Design a binder for these strands. Structure first.
Lengths: 222, 50, 51, 100, 50, 79, 50, 231
RNA sequence: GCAGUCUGA
DNA sequence: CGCCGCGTCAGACTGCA
DNA sequence: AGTCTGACGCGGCG
């Protein structure tokens, strides 16, 4: 027939980690490797929903460069540690977490004041280091639900953070040559995916394909 | 040879007197025969296609 | 006749079997190098860009 | 044809013998993939002459390099042609110009 | 004269247009020289070489 | 699968010795009735031999010891 | 001659490139920012590298 | 935030018989180019169409030949028939017949009329007859397919025999010749981040622009099932 | 098998 | 003054005993 | 052996 297309027969998932996988689909029609790979890549990168830190207000800091005593990082690095804070919120679109910690040593994410609906995916995520044994850091962290990546340069004494809403942190793919019964023009799509922990990789691939296939539902022939 | 002497006596036919020396298309070339020119020596019987 | 099983045989016959590739003039030692064959469908030998 | 050429295409094509150029001006009386019959003009035919030039075109013969040399009629029926006008393009000529 | 002829045909006189990748669908970062080159096919066919 | 023999070369400290040891073992596997010491992973006997070399399982000394032992035990099977 | 030009183009920097000055959590965020189109391949940036 | 607006096939503009502009709207920010390039690749590579795959002319034995009274070689007639833009309803194969005589061009309007076979460009010149006694008569087998299948690969179908005189034509089945697209900012009742995709198709006339978008999106949405389940 | 010619890298 | 050397691989076409 | 010859290199080396 002229409407029957090769559909992926071999789907090999290799979980290199809890948050990193390689999904090999084979075989695709010639040139479908790049179609599916690039559509999924674009959706995983810039259109996938999720929730991440957008703003933070530290008690004694007025702008991104004013340093704070007792902490071994400049504020430019506390914000860089907060940007990578993988967080889930179930029932809201905006939460204001609070991190109060004084004394000596690392301030991990486990020291954030608990709210029942906000999970922290990696409670061993270090945010700053207190050094003086009377150093106290008290900050308010605005977790906000969105989609994609929204740099702080666009959203312009609160401090802005680039809001990496998307759970995906690296999506790559390459299309190598598969073969079926002496046809070598077929394709084989190797997707290499790493999420931040809020979503296992194959679940992110599934949610991206669901997003695309739900966009297309106004044209499909059932 | 002896073993082949037994073989063609088993399946019941010995080889003919003529050898296959026919013209054949070279390997890899595949085309259409667009012209055939037959030249016979003067004094030789012309076959039907000549 | 090149039956379809001959190609499945061949994909095993050249599995770990290196072939030497040589481009004349072989001015120096690296003019002959052994690679593993990836069966391609063309008629042109494909040669890694770095060599 | 070349979109960018040098103008020496019409000489290279005509001066070799791949093309069939008209020996006398006239009108194409008949044109077939293997033949062109030109009816010579009244002021070009010698006295005591039929006045008709027949150009039998070479079709699909073997080159020395085993390529194909093939003459296609360039002119169409009823068209008037001048002396020295290309009537049949050869191999690697487009409408009279060399096209490789 | 080349640029005047380009400007006659509404093309950019710099000779380079912006192009998009066929596979990923996004624009190549720099303008790319596009134009019509007269290409030849030499008698060095790979059928005769293999 | 084998793409570089650099690991198998430190075990047999010469490259022209790796070839001979690996070829002796690969012939033991290919025409002898011998079985690999590593899991045969759809490899050729040359690559299986190198994968045995690089895991310390085979060198010329081990091959000679094993051949000596099998020669003596087959000489023992004479009633 | 094509890999050196690719890596020369990648590694260079421009002074007002898109996404200059921002602070990145690592190379993965840089690749995400590039493929998303939110930063130039030459954006002079501060990336935490291990 | 988790909700996405879904594009509808808002407008189709048939600029010409072979050229059209289909508008998908509204699209969320970012899905413009995603859908644009996905549909562009799917259309431009996998559309089904009809193409001439076999010609049988009565006095002709091979392509490298001439018919007396026909101005073109048989090879140029075949190269002209390769571009016959035809659409067939309810068949995957049909054998059209052409009979023409007398001086003049032999065009696709001179093909024997079948009800379920629509020749979308009747002015397509197939050959020229330059003699009042010349006459050409051929059988033209058009076939439905996908993509480009050359004749040298279709000699593989070694059924009982192919006669001498059945000239094989390369088959380029896809009807789409050019696909452009543009993502322009068009708005809804009250929103500014929505985009509008305008897919600009150029076909040979044997496919309907809406049907091509529906077919492309169906190919895509049935190829994404292996990703939606991911077993 | 050889000689001549041409060509390619 | 006579003798010894003067890159490699390859494809094609003739004519020759 | 008569050519209605060819020669028409070069650079070391012994």
């Amino acid at each position: 027939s002229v409407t029957e297309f090769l559909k992926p027969r071999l789907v090999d998932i290799e979980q290199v980690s809890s948050t990193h996988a390689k999904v090999t689909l084979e075989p695709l029609e010639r040139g479908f490797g790049h179609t599916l790979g690039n559509a999924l890549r674009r959706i995983l990168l810039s259109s996938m929903p999720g929730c991440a830190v957008t703003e933070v207000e530290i008690d004694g800091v007025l702008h991104e460069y004013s340093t704070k005593e007792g902490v071994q990082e400049d504020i430019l690095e506390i914000l860089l540690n907060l940007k990578g804070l993988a967080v889930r919120v179930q029932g809201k679109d905006e939460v204001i977490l609070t991190l109060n910690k004084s004394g000596i040593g690392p301030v991990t994410a486990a020291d954030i004041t608990h709210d029942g609906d906000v999970e922290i995916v990696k409670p061993q995520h270090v945010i700053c280091h207190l050094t003086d044994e009377n150093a106290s850091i008290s900050m308010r962290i605005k977790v906000q639900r969105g989609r994609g990546y929204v740099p702080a340069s666009t959203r312009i004494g609160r401090l802005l953070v680039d809001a990496c809403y998307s759970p995906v942190e690296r999506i790559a793919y390459n299309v190598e040559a598969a073969r079926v019964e002496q046809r070598t023009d077929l394709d084989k799509l190797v997707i290499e995916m790493e999420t931040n922990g809020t979503i296992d990789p194959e679940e992110a691939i599934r949610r991206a394909a669901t997003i695309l296939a739900e966009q297309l539902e106004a044209f499909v022939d059932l | 040879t002896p073993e082949e002497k037994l073989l063609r006596a088993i399946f019941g036919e010995k080889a003919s007197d003529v050898k296959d020396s026919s013209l054949r298309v070279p390997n890899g070339v595949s085309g259409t025969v667009i012209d055939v020119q037959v030249f016979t020596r003067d004094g030789v019987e012309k076959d039907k296609r000549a | 006749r090149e039956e379809a099983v001959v190609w499945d045989i061949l994909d095993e016959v050249i599995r770990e079997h290196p072939v030497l590739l040589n481009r004349a003039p072989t001015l120096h030692r690296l003019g002959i190098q052994a690679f593993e064959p990836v069966l391609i469908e063309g008629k042109a030998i494909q040669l890694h860009p770095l060599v | 044809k070349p979109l960018v050429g040098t103008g020496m295409e019409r000489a290279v094509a005509v001066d070799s013998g791949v093309t069939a150029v008209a020996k006398r001006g006239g009108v194409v009386q008949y044109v077939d993939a293997s033949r062109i019959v030109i009816k010579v003009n009244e002021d070009e035919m010698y006295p005591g002459e039929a006045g008709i030039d027949i150009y039998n075109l070479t079709k699909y013969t073997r080159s020395n390099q085993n390529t194909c040399i093939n003459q296609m009629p360039c002119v169409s029926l009823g068209e008037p042609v001048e002396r020295g006008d290309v009537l049949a393009d050869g191999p690697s000529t487009d409408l009279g110009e060399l096209a490789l | 004269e080349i640029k005047e002829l380009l400007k006659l045909g509404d093309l950019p006189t710099s000779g380079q247009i912006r192009l998009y990748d066929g596979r990923t669908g996004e624009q190549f970062e720099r303008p790319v020289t596009v134009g019509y080159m007269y290409m030849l096919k030499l008698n060095h066919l790979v059928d005769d070489k293999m | 699968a084998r793409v570089t023999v650099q690991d198998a070369v430190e075990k047999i400290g010469n490259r022209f010795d790796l070839v001979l040891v690996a070829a002796r073992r690969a012939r033991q596997m290919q025409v002898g009735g011998k079985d690999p010491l590593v899991p045969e992973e759809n490899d050729k006997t040359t690559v299986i031999a190198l994968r045995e070399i690089e895991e310390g399982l085979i060198n010329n000394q081990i091959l000679d010891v094993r051949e000596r032992q099998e020669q003596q035990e087959q000489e023992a099977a004479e009633l | 001659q094509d890999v050196v030009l690719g890596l020369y183009y990648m590694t260079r920097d421009c002074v007002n490139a898109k996404g200059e000055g921002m602070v990145l959590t690592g190379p993965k965020e840089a690749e995400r920012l590039y493929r998303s189109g939110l930063a130039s391949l030459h954006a002079r940036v501060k990336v935490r590298i291990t």
